[PDB]
Design an enzyme around this catalytic site. Structure first.
Site, short mmCIF file in Angstrom:
data_model
loop_
_atom_site.label_atom_id
_atom_site.label_comp_id
_atom_site.label_asym_id
_atom_site.label_seq_id
_atom_site.Cartn_x
_atom_site.Cartn_y
_atom_site.Cartn_z
N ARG A 87 0.59 0.43 15.47
CA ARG A 87 0.70 0.32 14.01
C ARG A 87 1.00 -1.15 13.63
N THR A 129 6.35 27.03 6.92
CA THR A 129 5.09 26.39 6.46
C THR A 129 3.94 27.34 6.79
N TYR A 187 8.85 15.75 2.20
CA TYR A 187 8.87 17.12 1.60
C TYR A 187 8.81 17.04 0.07
N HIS A 246 12.76 11.52 5.59
CA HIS A 246 12.17 12.85 5.93
C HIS A 246 12.18 13.72 4.68
N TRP A 302 7.10 -0.27 4.95
CA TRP A 302 7.77 0.44 3.81
C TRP A 302 9.19 0.91 4.17
N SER A 354 15.20 6.31 -11.67
CA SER A 354 14.17 7.08 -12.41
C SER A 354 14.16 8.51 -11.86
N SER A 355 14.00 8.65 -10.55
CA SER A 355 13.82 10.00 -9.95
C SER A 355 15.14 10.78 -9.93
N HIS A 368 0.85 -1.22 0.00
CA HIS A 368 0.00 0.00 0.00
C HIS A 368 0.88 1.26 0.00
N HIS A 423 13.70 12.33 14.26
CA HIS A 423 12.34 12.34 14.85
C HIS A 423 11.58 11.06 14.50
N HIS A 424 12.11 10.22 13.61
CA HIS A 424 11.56 8.87 13.34
C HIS A 424 12.17 7.84 14.29
N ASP A 482 11.17 22.00 -24.79
CA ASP A 482 11.08 20.67 -24.18
C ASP A 482 11.94 20.72 -22.90
N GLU A 520 11.97 12.80 1.74
CA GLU A 520 10.96 12.16 0.87
C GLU A 520 9.58 12.77 1.17
N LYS A 571 3.47 30.03 4.23
CA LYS A 571 2.76 29.61 3.01
C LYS A 571 1.24 29.60 3.28
N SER A 597 -0.58 26.96 -4.84
CA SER A 597 -0.34 28.40 -5.11
C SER A 597 -1.01 28.81 -6.43
C1 HEA Z 1 3.42 14.75 2.92
C2 HEA Z 1 3.86 14.06 3.90
C3 HEA Z 1 4.31 14.61 5.19
C4 HEA Z 1 4.53 15.95 5.57
C5 HEA Z 1 4.53 17.18 4.76
C6 HEA Z 1 4.89 15.81 7.01
C7 HEA Z 1 5.19 16.99 7.79
C8 HEA Z 1 5.56 16.99 9.16
N1 HEA Z 1 5.67 15.87 9.90
FE1 HEA Z 1 5.36 13.93 9.32
N2 HEA Z 1 5.17 11.98 8.67
C9 HEA Z 1 4.80 11.55 7.47
C10 HEA Z 1 4.45 12.40 6.36
C11 HEA Z 1 4.54 13.83 6.38
N3 HEA Z 1 4.86 14.57 7.47
C12 HEA Z 1 4.85 10.11 7.34
C13 HEA Z 1 4.56 9.27 6.16
C14 HEA Z 1 5.23 9.64 8.61
C15 HEA Z 1 5.41 8.24 9.11
C16 HEA Z 1 6.63 7.63 8.55
C17 HEA Z 1 6.56 6.13 8.97
O1 HEA Z 1 6.92 5.78 10.14
O2 HEA Z 1 6.03 5.32 8.14
C18 HEA Z 1 5.38 10.90 9.37
C19 HEA Z 1 5.87 10.84 10.69
C20 HEA Z 1 6.28 11.98 11.45
C21 HEA Z 1 7.00 11.87 12.74
C22 HEA Z 1 7.46 10.68 13.49
C23 HEA Z 1 6.39 10.23 14.45
C24 HEA Z 1 6.68 8.80 14.96
O3 HEA Z 1 6.87 7.86 14.08
O4 HEA Z 1 6.64 8.60 16.22
C25 HEA Z 1 7.17 13.23 13.17
C26 HEA Z 1 7.95 13.63 14.38
O5 HEA Z 1 8.22 14.82 14.55
C27 HEA Z 1 6.58 14.05 12.06
C28 HEA Z 1 6.43 15.48 12.12
C29 HEA Z 1 6.10 16.31 11.04
C30 HEA Z 1 6.16 17.78 11.17
C31 HEA Z 1 6.59 18.62 12.36
C32 HEA Z 1 5.87 18.24 9.86
C33 HEA Z 1 5.81 19.67 9.41
O6 HEA Z 1 6.41 19.74 8.12
C34 HEA Z 1 4.35 20.18 9.48
C35 HEA Z 1 4.35 21.69 9.38
C36 HEA Z 1 2.99 22.31 9.17
C37 HEA Z 1 2.29 22.98 10.10
C38 HEA Z 1 2.74 23.16 11.49
C39 HEA Z 1 0.92 23.52 9.74
C40 HEA Z 1 0.86 24.90 9.06
C41 HEA Z 1 1.44 25.96 9.91
C42 HEA Z 1 0.73 26.99 10.46
C43 HEA Z 1 -0.74 27.25 10.26
C44 HEA Z 1 1.54 28.00 11.26
C45 HEA Z 1 1.33 27.98 12.73
C46 HEA Z 1 1.77 26.72 13.43
C47 HEA Z 1 2.33 26.62 14.65
C48 HEA Z 1 2.63 27.80 15.55
C49 HEA Z 1 2.60 25.25 15.23
N4 HEA Z 1 5.89 13.29 11.10
C1 HEA Z 2 0.47 8.94 -0.59
C2 HEA Z 2 0.50 8.16 0.46
C3 HEA Z 2 -0.72 7.54 1.00
C4 HEA Z 2 -2.11 7.61 0.64
C5 HEA Z 2 -2.81 8.47 -0.33
C6 HEA Z 2 -2.75 6.67 1.58
C7 HEA Z 2 -4.17 6.43 1.55
C8 HEA Z 2 -4.96 5.57 2.38
N1 HEA Z 2 -4.38 4.86 3.37
FE1 HEA Z 2 -2.40 4.67 3.85
N2 HEA Z 2 -0.42 4.52 4.31
C9 HEA Z 2 0.58 5.16 3.79
C10 HEA Z 2 0.47 6.09 2.71
C11 HEA Z 2 -0.71 6.49 2.06
N3 HEA Z 2 -1.92 5.99 2.40
C12 HEA Z 2 1.89 4.86 4.37
C13 HEA Z 2 3.19 5.41 4.01
C14 HEA Z 2 1.59 3.90 5.43
C15 HEA Z 2 2.51 3.25 6.39
C16 HEA Z 2 2.93 1.88 5.82
C17 HEA Z 2 3.73 1.10 6.90
O1 HEA Z 2 3.32 1.05 8.11
O2 HEA Z 2 4.86 0.54 6.56
C18 HEA Z 2 0.14 3.80 5.30
C19 HEA Z 2 -0.55 2.98 6.21
C20 HEA Z 2 -1.98 2.90 6.30
C21 HEA Z 2 -2.68 2.31 7.45
C22 HEA Z 2 -2.06 1.76 8.66
C23 HEA Z 2 -1.80 0.25 8.55
C24 HEA Z 2 -1.26 -0.37 9.84
O3 HEA Z 2 -0.54 0.36 10.60
O4 HEA Z 2 -1.52 -1.59 10.08
C25 HEA Z 2 -4.10 2.43 7.10
C26 HEA Z 2 -5.22 2.03 7.98
O5 HEA Z 2 -6.35 2.36 7.74
C27 HEA Z 2 -4.15 3.10 5.79
C28 HEA Z 2 -5.32 3.37 5.03
C29 HEA Z 2 -5.40 4.23 3.91
C30 HEA Z 2 -6.72 4.52 3.33
C31 HEA Z 2 -8.00 3.90 3.75
C32 HEA Z 2 -6.43 5.43 2.29
C33 HEA Z 2 -7.40 6.04 1.42
O6 HEA Z 2 -7.48 7.42 1.80
C34 HEA Z 2 -7.02 5.88 0.00
C35 HEA Z 2 -8.17 6.41 -0.91
C36 HEA Z 2 -7.87 6.60 -2.35
C37 HEA Z 2 -7.24 7.62 -2.87
C38 HEA Z 2 -6.76 8.72 -2.02
C39 HEA Z 2 -7.08 7.74 -4.38
C40 HEA Z 2 -5.77 7.52 -4.82
C41 HEA Z 2 -5.71 7.64 -6.33
C42 HEA Z 2 -5.42 8.72 -7.06
C43 HEA Z 2 -5.14 10.06 -6.43
C44 HEA Z 2 -5.36 8.51 -8.56
C45 HEA Z 2 -5.86 9.75 -9.24
C46 HEA Z 2 -6.06 9.61 -10.73
C47 HEA Z 2 -5.76 10.65 -11.54
C48 HEA Z 2 -5.23 11.97 -11.01
C49 HEA Z 2 -5.98 10.49 -13.01
N4 HEA Z 2 -2.84 3.32 5.25
CU CU Z 3 10.16 13.05 9.20
#
Ligand code: HEA
Ligand code: HEA
Ligand code: CU
Ligand code: CDL
Ligand code: CDL
Ligand code: PEK
Ligand code: PGV
Ligand code: DMU
Ligand code: DMU
Ligand code: DMU
Ligand code: DMU
Ligand code: CHD
Ligand code: CHD
Ligand code: LFA
Ligand code: CUA
Ligand code: MG
Ligand code: NA
Ligand code: ZN
Lengths: 102, 56, 227, 70, 49, 143, 40, 44, 513, 72, 44
Positions: free
Chosen positions: I438, I316, I244, I240, I126, I156-157, I61, I290-291, I91, I242, I319, I255
């Site tokens: 999890r 953030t 961003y 991390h 993953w 690729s990337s 997934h 932080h992971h 291009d 990734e 923005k 935007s």
């Molecule tokens: C698009 C994906 C994405 C993005 C952008 C982020 C953004 C952030 N993430 Fe996250 N994160 C994940 C995807 C993402 N994360 C995934 C996939 C995991 C799990 C990985 C795994 O274990 O599988 C994860 C896990 C993860 C962890 C580890 C938790 C754990 O496993 O125990 C932490 C710890 O700090 C973290 C923090 C943050 C923070 C601080 C940001 C910041 O960038 C957020 C900043 C944004 C805001 C704060 C909101 C807007 C701001 C305002 C409106 C201004 C005012 C705000 C304040 C004064 C607070 N995330």
């Molecule tokens: C992009 C990243 C992404 C997205 C979109 C999602 C989407 C969803 N995810 Fe998941 N998920 C993860 C990334 C993502 N996930 C990751 C990284 C983990 C952790 C894995 C791990 O523990 O190792 C995770 C784990 C995770 C768990 C935890 C499993 C566990 O700990 O045992 C669950 C539980 O409900 C869940 C559910 C779902 C559901 C119900 C959706 C639904 O919201 C999905 C619904 C469908 C969509 C959002 C459409 C997607 C399709 C398109 C956008 C195509 C569009 C077509 C055109 C533009 C032409 N996902």
């Molecule tokens: Cu991180």
């Protein structure tokens, strides 16, 4: 200041040989501001429409005054009141008089 | 050796509609066919190998 | 343990868990307020026919947008780091216990004085006694003295596991070749439950942790009886 | 005749009024949340532990049969 | 000239709402789903030992 | 006024309340009577009839402000259709419950839950706020 | 945006067919697998 | 190469019913695949 | 002709089209995987099997949603279609290398689906941590096929990042500075820099895992003096950045969409938006541990990673507030794309804020490896990255295709998806706070109500995905051809018509100084 | 260009200084002075200093710099 | 200059504007930037 802004806009529309492009540029730029243009600016834009033999643009200018007032329903009827002497002199019908408010 | 770049410039600019990978002549077509045959055949063999490895 | 329809943290069993609840309350208020303010401002931007589409000057407003968030982060970081350093502080434990993670059960070693060790496995669903909890009971609980600072050392003899007890604020990864330390102090007697918190294969869902917190004298007699 | 209404800065005036309104509500919510959540929790824990008898709690649990060790 | 929304909007809103409520109420209450609500104020505790 | 694909690079007409005087007239080609109407517009507008004024407006512009800004019943269709599809989703969940899910574990039986509830109260699960806090140990009943 | 009227209009009936066929193409194969899980 | 709407794509939109079949097979095969992989793993 | 055009492409638009088709197919796979997850958890007990089959599904997934759906759609699809058009370039710099970035993905995907078919699959998460991912606890080909899948997606990337950076630096009009390029173009250049620096470190780490599994190395094996925690550092040094990489192009599309449907010529605070994206990109390299707050690192290290992670909220926030300031005073068009973008601003903010909660090491002890993390990342991915993709897709579909969507259907689609994703993920906060781990196939009975509701949400999201396929069909079926597009003076990608000719900017734009 | 270097000055360099300034001003509190031990490798006096009484270092701090014989 | 009868102009109306104003310039009478009014003439 407000008086200096309004004076610049009156002068802009009062240019005797203002062209169609300048009339449009003026009105399309003016409606970007956070204001409903003062009657003296609209008067000068309506007289530009007269020099340019453009009746339709004069009506559209009155519509855009109403639109820029948003929910402030008091502004448009005030501006029309202030413009009545110009509307009578130039034979400009309001959007309401032409049924274009429906 | 002698500088024969001008003769290669004439060959590769010839107005014959060929893409650059075939513009050297018949040898390019042969090496193209060998490459694409090994790639496509190899890919079909990789799929057969997956089929085999997918069961105990 | 968790109870049905639970929204927040399990009730605190240790002082540090109490501290984490109050720190979470403070942080959650901030999260609520910022989320609310953004939604309200979206709805404000979208509910007027009044327009202003000419170029807007950014620099004054960008001061507010950076300073106010910087202050808010400092107001989170200060108590966050106070709690971080409080958990790390030197405490003088009375007792050391080891746990080793395995596929798929915990072993415990109490080797301060005698060689006491045993395995702790999930009670199968079909063998639960009436009133017992599915996926949470073990055959052999981790009996510990209440109201005493205990050093827990955590490792694994195979893959990663993680030894967690939410109501005490505890989660320590179980890594082969590594001895990780945490401290445990229960303010109360009772039964405190946790679950393996690192993906460890087929029965990751089915190797829980049960602490049994009792007076020292009961712990001593239990220890003696388990040799 | 109609009075001359305010014609300038109506969007800016609406924004100013409502951001101030939002600030005031923000302070109202923080006071509320202090009282309904944060302080309620401090007082629940303080009231629980003020006269808490851990040995009496244990004796109740022991007599209910919950322990392996007692 | 009246469009799709003018002609059918009222019926689509009324039917959609009625259908949605009916089928979710049936799913939630009539087919044996276990929601596991809180015992608080609901369950009479019974001797287990 | 027929707008053509092949015209994409030319100045085009728009009805937008923020762009009141677009780059071209709605109607560029004039009939004999529309030509005479544009000649009459060079004289006093007081001499134009209401119909002639409306006709001059409709040559310059497609929709009035009132027309381009009008509300629609679209929200009824969107909300109704969303509720229909969310309703359809419950059919999938009914199908799943009937044909995919087997029985849930025996620990959800009413008698098991009654006994487990007492055992949770005997071990004082969440005694400060969450669970046992809501039990009256003096009166033997929920508060 | 403005656009031409549809070169090949899709009637309400035609839309019901497309939507029906789309949904079935997702639901029938998954449904067949999940219905047969016990047998697997 | 053909230019313009319906020509800058590797699939035909000349016939909406042939297109429905192709789209059904395309998105349907992607959605089906995991169910058939699970079936495969369960049947070993 | 067909082979030359679609297998031998050197055209940025056709290659963008291939990426969008690939990503759409991948999204159907990732959706099916997400429904199997939620089917398993939708009632207490076991549906499929034990944690191995379950975690094969969870692992696949994540890989499919991240590597085959989001990255190909945002970078390969929108990036290839829009970047050259937005800078008036004819291009990409390396139009043939561009085609190899695309054609590496089908094979990458084939290796991932092979991993799941052979032996018992890669039930690793993953993150692929050893020793579970090692040759004792995961004997056989599954994990090696996963590593090789990642290698091909990596190459690729990396080649794609070289292509975007070169194109964006080297192929603008000579009068155009970097401070006259659109925000989407900035978002792709910064994403490309993150990919260039992060993916090689992942490549090194998974290569070490490959050699531990097959050549008797011991990088991660304590018996040889190795350390499982070293793998975690190398993985998250990539992981991390990734996240961003996953959101930055979404920021760029947001935007453009907010600016466009606000009737504005420009986003509020352009240079602030550039500053914010560069700041987020830089800070995203110094926070990875932080992971790892529960692995046993020193207190001062935990204090540093807490603080550095929280700093990301400042740029953030600029923005989010700049998007609100762009709406301010707009002539708002309530298009389906605007609805996606407004949902993005709100739901991304909520997930960003739960990320700030997790940044606190002390609180992360109790939240780590719980559904609280799952709630955080699905708010930013399934309601952030996905909402930006859906907004960008409905906004630019008429540019790409020359046809319009039915806006009423698109609004229906938005409404259903909005309900389903919130119903799915909001309750996972409660499951996290209350301690549900999890990667569990089953849960203690107390967690039943929120798991039931979450699974019901997932089914609503499935209905939205099915409707989306119908909506694309209806657009191609009906053939409503685009006529006029507003605001071309500040949206160059539209100025060559819909669709644009195969060759655009054969004669470059005229821009003077 | 100057524009880029100004952008780095205000967007990266001075923010870094502001954060290190905050870090430093949070750990600025006076630490506990350690017990005096008259170690022979410290407080070296082979020749009197050419200022004061000959026995005080140039930036002598009474709070933290003991003399050969101990804290003043 | 153009080798055809129209070319895209980008107008940076003021030094250091981030916003470029884009439009087709056609053979014939000079056209004006719709933002700043700057005149441009095509010389095919
Ligand atoms: C698009 C994906 C994405 C993005 C952008 C982020 C953004 C952030 N993430 Fe996250 N994160 C994940 C995807 C993402 N994360 C995934 C996939 C995991 C799990 C990985 C795994 O274990 O599988 C994860 C896990 C993860 C962890 C580890 C938790 C754990 O496993 O125990 C932490 C710890 O700090 C973290 C923090 C943050 C923070 C601080 C940001 C910041 O960038 C957020 C900043 C944004 C805001 C704060 C909101 C807007 C701001 C305002 C409106 C201004 C005012 C705000 C304040 C004064 C607070 N995330
Ligand atoms: C992009 C990243 C992404 C997205 C979109 C999602 C989407 C969803 N995810 Fe998941 N998920 C993860 C990334 C993502 N996930 C990751 C990284 C983990 C952790 C894995 C791990 O523990 O190792 C995770 C784990 C995770 C768990 C935890 C499993 C566990 O700990 O045992 C669950 C539980 O409900 C869940 C559910 C779902 C559901 C119900 C959706 C639904 O919201 C999905 C619904 C469908 C969509 C959002 C459409 C997607 C399709 C398109 C956008 C195509 C569009 C077509 C055109 C533009 C032409 N996902
Ligand atoms: Cu991180
Ligand atoms: C479209 C969507 C479709 C449906 C979505 C799913 C619906 C879920 C239903 C929730 C209802 C829960 C319930 O049974 O309520 C009874 C419940 C009974 O009250 P209680 O037992 O006294 O609980 C008080 C807790 O002790 C309070 O203390 P606690 O320690 O027990 O509280 C912690 C708890 C408490 O948090 C909550 O109660 C969440 C409320 C959500 C607001 C909407 O959890 C959280 O921290 C959640 C984290 C959320 C992340 C940030 C969310 C951003 C907010 C967005 C702002 C928009 C506002 C306008 O009443 C509620 O509080 C209502 C909820
Ligand atoms: C794990 C694997 C990873 C899977 C990833 C899948 C994604 C891949 C993405 C790339 C798509 C493929 C395109 C390139 C190669 C395909 C070759 C082929 O046969 O294509 C036929 C087929 C179209 O057939 P047509 O309508 O007969 O052909 C019209 C030609 O103009 C007339 O051309 P012609 O008349 O000269 O010759 C056409 C003829 C023969 O053409 C040739 O001469 C080609 C000969 C060599 C072809 C090698 C390419 C193989 C594909 C590579 C990926 C594997 O084609 C046929 O009718 C028979 C071909 C049968 C083979 C089908 C392969 C299609 C993709 C497979 C999907 C996944 C399968 C996995 C199964 C999973 C089960 C567990 O092309 C496609 O498959 C296109 C996709 C299907 C329609 C989906 C539409 C969805 C709309 C979504 C909207 C998103 C875009 C938004 C922007 C839109 C405006 C710009
Ligand atoms: C604030 C930022 C830095 C400031 C720099 C210095 C300020 C004053 C002196 C200027 C000259 C510095 C050059 C280096 C020389 C030697 C010592 C300087 C370092 C200094 O200032 O050290 C001080 C001692 O100075 C001492 O002894 C006395 C120092 C004064 C006498 C120095 C005489 C020696 C001159 C040698 C010249 C040689 C030149 C080489 C030429 C080469 C050509 C081929 C340290 O104070 P302290 O109390 O011991 O400890 C602190 C306890 N709280
Ligand atoms: C476990 C085993 C997994 C291994 C997987 C291997 C993956 C794929 C097999 C690779 C096959 C390579 C075939 C040759 C590719 C040459 C690319 C090249 O040389 O690309 C050039 C551009 O890249 C440039 O310069 C600079 C960049 C040149 C890069 C060359 C190829 C690198 C491939 C491996 C990279 C891995 C990265 C290692 C760091 C982690 C040219 O660009 P074109 O668009 O062609 O032309 C543009 C025209 O104007 C030229 O006249
Ligand atoms: C352009 C088209 C592309 C070309 C495709 C070529 C496909 C044909 C390859 C022949 O297949 C071989 O079969 C052998 C069976 O005899 C195997 O031997 C190997 O496996 C044997 C099986 O017992 C063992 O003895 C040894 O491991 C070893 O000899 C070997 O794996 C395999 O290659
Ligand atoms: C948090 C979101 C709130 C959005 C706040 C946006 C504030 C924008 C202010 C900048 O616009 C100004 O408005 C003034 C006229 O009123 C102009 O005179 C001035 O020149 C212009 O710069
Ligand atoms: C849980 C998430 C659920 C999301 C629900 C989505 C709701 C769907 C809205 C569709 O309804 C329509 O929306 C139009 C805009 O899309 C309105 O335009 C009208 O109102 C606007 C004023 O705000 C103007 O811009 C327009 O000119 C005007 O026609 C129109 O009247 C209304 O029926
Ligand atoms: C997560 C995605 C999936 C969500 C749920 C999907 C909804 C189900 C759609 C229908 O699926 C079908 O259901 C039938 C039963 O209703 C099955 O027939 C089975 O049952 C019939 C009645 O017992 C027999 O006649 C058939 O032979 C037998 O195959 C049939 O195979 C299956 O395709
Ligand atoms: C005779 C020939 C002329 C090349 C030319 O001008 O065409 C010379 C020029 C430089 C020579 C090469 C270089 O001197 C370096 C090498 C020296 C070795 O002794 C022989 C091989 C060696 C690789 C030479 C081969 C050959 O004799 C070269 C190539
Ligand atoms: C100097 C640079 C570019 C200005 C330009 O050449 O147009 C601008 C763009 C964004 C600006 C920054 C952002 O607006 C965010 C911060 C805002 C604060 O009010 C000052 C520091 C702050 C960090 C700013 C410093 C500086 O003014 C920056 C970095
Ligand atoms: C084109 C470069 C512009 C420089 C902007 C610097 C401000 C952002 C600072 C964060 C880190 C940037 C690293 C480079
Ligand atoms: Cu042991 Cu998970
Ligand atoms: Mg972990
Ligand atoms: Na299950
Ligand atoms: Zn200009």
């Amino acid at each position: 200041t407000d008086e200096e802004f309004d004076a610049r806009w009156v002068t802009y529309f009062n240019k005797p040989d203002i062209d169609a492009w300048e009339l449009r540029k003026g009105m399309n730029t003016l409606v970007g501001y956070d204001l409903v243009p003062e009657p003296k600016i609209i008067d000068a834009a309506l007289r530009a429409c007269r020099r340019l033999n453009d009746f339709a643009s004069a009506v559209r200018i009155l519509e855009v005054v109403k639109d820029k007032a948003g929910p402030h329903k008091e502004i448009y009827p005030y501006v029309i009141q202030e413009l009545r002497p110009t509307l009578n002199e130039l034979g400009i019908s309001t959007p309401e008089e032409l049924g274009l408010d429906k | 050796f002698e500088n024969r770049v001008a003769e290669k410039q004439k060959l590769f600019q010839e107005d014959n509609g060929l893409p650059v990978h075939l513009k050297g002549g018949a040898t390019d077509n042969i090496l193209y066919r060998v490459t694409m045959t090994l790639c496509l055949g190899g890919t079909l063999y990789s799929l057969y190998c997956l089929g085999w490895a997918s069961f105990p | 343990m968790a109870y049905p329809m639970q929204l927040g943290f399990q009730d605190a069993t240790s002082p540090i868990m109490e501290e984490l609840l109050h720190f979470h309350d403070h942080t959650l208020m901030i999260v609520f307020l910022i989320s609310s303010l953004v939604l309200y401002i979206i709805s404000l931007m979208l509910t007027t026919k009044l327009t202003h589409t000419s170029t807007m000057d950014a620099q004054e407003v960008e001061t507010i947008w950076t300073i106010l968030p910087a202050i808010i982060l400092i107001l989170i970081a200060l108590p966050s780091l106070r709690i971080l350093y409080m958990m790390d502080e030197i405490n003088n434990p009375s007792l050391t216990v080891k746990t080793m993670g395995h596929q798929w059960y915990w072993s415990y070693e109490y080797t301060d004085y005698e060689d006491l060790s045993f395995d702790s496995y999930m009670i199968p669903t079909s063998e639960l006694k009436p009133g017992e909890l599915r996926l949470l009971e073990v055959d052999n609980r981790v009996v510990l003295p209440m109201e005493m600072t205990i050093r827990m050392l955590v490792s694994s003899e195979d893959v990663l596991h993680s030894w967690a007890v939410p109501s005490l604020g505890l989660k320590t990864d179980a890594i082969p070749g590594r001895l990780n330390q945490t401290t445990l102090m229960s303010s109360r007697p009772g039964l405190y439950y946790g679950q393996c918190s690192e993906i460890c294969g087929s029965n990751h869902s089915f190797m829980p942790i049960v602490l049994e917190l009792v007076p020292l004298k009961y712990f001593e007699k239990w220890s003696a009886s388990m040799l | 005749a109609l009075a001359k209404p305010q014609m300038r800065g109506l969007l800016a005036r609406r924004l100013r009024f409502h951001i101030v309104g939002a600030f005031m509500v923000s302070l109202g919510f923080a006071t509320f949340y202090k009282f309904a959540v944060a302080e309620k929790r401090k007082k629940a824990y303080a009231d629980f532990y003020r006269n808490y008898d851990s040995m009496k709690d244990f004796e109740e649990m022991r007599k209910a049969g919950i322990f392996q060790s007692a | 000239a009246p469009d799709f929304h003018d002609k059918y909007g009222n019926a689509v809103l009324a039917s959609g709402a009625t259908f949605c409520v009916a089928v979710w109420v049936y799913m939630a209450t009539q087919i044996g789903i276990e929601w596991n609500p809180s015992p608080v104020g609901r369950v009479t505790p019974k001797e287990w030992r | 006024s027929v707008v053509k694909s092949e015209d994409y690079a030319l100045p085009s007409y728009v009805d937008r309340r923020d762009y009141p005087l677009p780059d071209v007239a709605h109607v560029k080609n004039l009939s004999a009577s529309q030509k005479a109407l544009k000649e009459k517009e060079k004289a006093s507008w007081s001499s134009l009839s209401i119909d002639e004024k409306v006709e001059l407006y409709r040559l310059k512009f497609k929709e009035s402000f009132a027309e381009m800004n009008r509300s629609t019943n679209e929200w009824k269709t969107v909300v109704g259709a969303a509720m229909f599809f969310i309703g359809f989703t419950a059919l999938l969940l009914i199908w799943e419950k009937h044909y995919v899910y087997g029985p849930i574990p025996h620990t959800f039986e009413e008698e098991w839950v009654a006994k487990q509830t007492k055992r949770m109260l005997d071990m004082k699960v969440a005694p400060i706020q969450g669970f046992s806090a809501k039990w009256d140990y003096d009166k033997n009943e929920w508060k | 945006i403005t656009a031409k009227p549809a070169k090949t209009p899709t009637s309400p009936k035609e839309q019901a067919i497309g939507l029906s066929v789309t949904f079935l193409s997702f639901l029938l194969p998954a449904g067949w697998v999940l219905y047969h899980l016990d047998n697997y | 190469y053909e230019e313009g709407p319906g020509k800058n794509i590797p699939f035909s939109v000349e016939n909406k019913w042939r297109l429905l079949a192709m789209m059904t097979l395309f998105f349907g095969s992607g959605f089906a695949a995991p169910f058939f992989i699970v079936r495969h793993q369960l049947l070993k | 002709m067909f082979i030359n055009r679609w297998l031998f492409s050197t055209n940025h638009k056709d290659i963008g089209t291939l990426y969008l088709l690939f990503g759409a197919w991948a999204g159907m796979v990732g959706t099916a995987l997400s429904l199997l997850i939620r089917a398993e958890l939708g009632q207490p007990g076991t549906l499929l099997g034990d944690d191995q089959i379950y975690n094969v599904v969870v692992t696949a997934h994540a890989f499919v949603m991240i590597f085959f759906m989001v990255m190909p759609i945002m970078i390969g699809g929108f990036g290839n279609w829009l970047v050259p058009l937005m800078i008036g370039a004819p291009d990409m710099a390396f139009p043939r290398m561009n085609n190899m970035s695309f054609w590496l993905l089908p094979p990458s995907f084939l290796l991932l689906l092979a991993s799941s078919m052979v032996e018992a699959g890669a039930g690793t998460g993953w993150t692929v941590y050893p020793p579970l991912a090692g040759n004792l606890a995961h004997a056989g080909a599954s994990v090696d096929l996963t590593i090789f899948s990642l290698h091909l997606a990596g190459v690729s990337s990396i080649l794609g990042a070289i292509n975007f950076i070169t194109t964006i630096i080297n192929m603008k009009p000579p009068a155009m500075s970097q401070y006259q390029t659109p925000l989407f173009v900035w978002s792709v250049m910064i994403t490309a820099v993150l990919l260039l620096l992060s993916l090689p470190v992942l490549a090194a780490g998974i290569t070490m895992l490959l050699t531990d599994r097959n050549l008797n190395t011991t990088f991660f094996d304590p018996a040889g003096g190795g350390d499982p925690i070293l793998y975690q550092h190398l993985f998250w040094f990539f992981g991390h950045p990734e996240v961003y990489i996953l959101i930055l192009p979404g920021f760029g599309m947001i935007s453009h969409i907010v600016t466009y449907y606000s009737g504005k010529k420009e986003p509020f605070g352009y240079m602030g938006m550039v500053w914010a994206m560069m700041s987020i990109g830089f800070l995203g390299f110094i926070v990875w541990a932080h992971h790892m707050f529960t692995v046993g690192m020193d207190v001062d290290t935990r204090a540093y990673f807490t603080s550095a992670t929280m700093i990301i909220a400042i740029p953030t926030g600029v923005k989010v507030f700049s998007w609100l300031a762009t709406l301010h005073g707009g002539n708002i068009k309530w298009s389906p794309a605007m609805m996606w973008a407004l949902g993005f601003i709100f739901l991304f903010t909520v997930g960003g804020l739960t990320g700030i909660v997790l940044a606190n090491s002390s609180l992360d002890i109790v939240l780590h490896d719980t559904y609280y993390v799952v709630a955080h990342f699905h708010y930013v991915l399934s309601m952030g990255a996905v909402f930006a993709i859906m907004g960008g897709f409905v906004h630019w579909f008429p540019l790409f295709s020359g046809y319009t969507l039915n806006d009423t259907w698109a609004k229906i689609h938005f409404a259903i998806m909005f309900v389903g994703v919130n119903m799915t993920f909001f309750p996972q906060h409660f499951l996290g706070l209350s301690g549900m781990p999890r990667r569990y196939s089953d849960y203690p009975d107390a967690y039943t109500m929120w798991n039931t509701i979450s699974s019901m949400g997932s089914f609503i999201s499935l209905t939205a995905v099915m409707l989306m396929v119908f909506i694309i069909w209806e657009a191609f079926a009906s053939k409503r051809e685009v006529l006029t597009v507003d605001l071309t003076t500040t949206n160059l990608e539209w100025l060559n018509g819909c669709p644009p000719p195969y060759h655009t900017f054969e004669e470059p734009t005229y821009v003077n100084l | 260009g100057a524009r880029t270097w100004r952008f780095l000055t205000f967007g990266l360099a001075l923010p870094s200084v502001a954060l290190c300034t905050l870090n430093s001003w949070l750990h600025s509190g006076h630490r506990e002075r350690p017990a005096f031990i008259p170690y022979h490798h410290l407080r070296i006096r082979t020749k009197p200093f050419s200022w004061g009484d000959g026995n005080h270092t140039f930036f002598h701090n009474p709070r933290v710099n003991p003399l050969p014989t101990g804290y003043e | 200059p153009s080798i055809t009868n129209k070319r895209i102009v980008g107008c940076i109306c003021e030094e250091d504007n981030s916003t470029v104003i884009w439009f087709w310039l056609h053979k014939g009478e000079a056209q004006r930037c719709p933002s700043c009014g700057t005149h441009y003439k095509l010389v095919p």
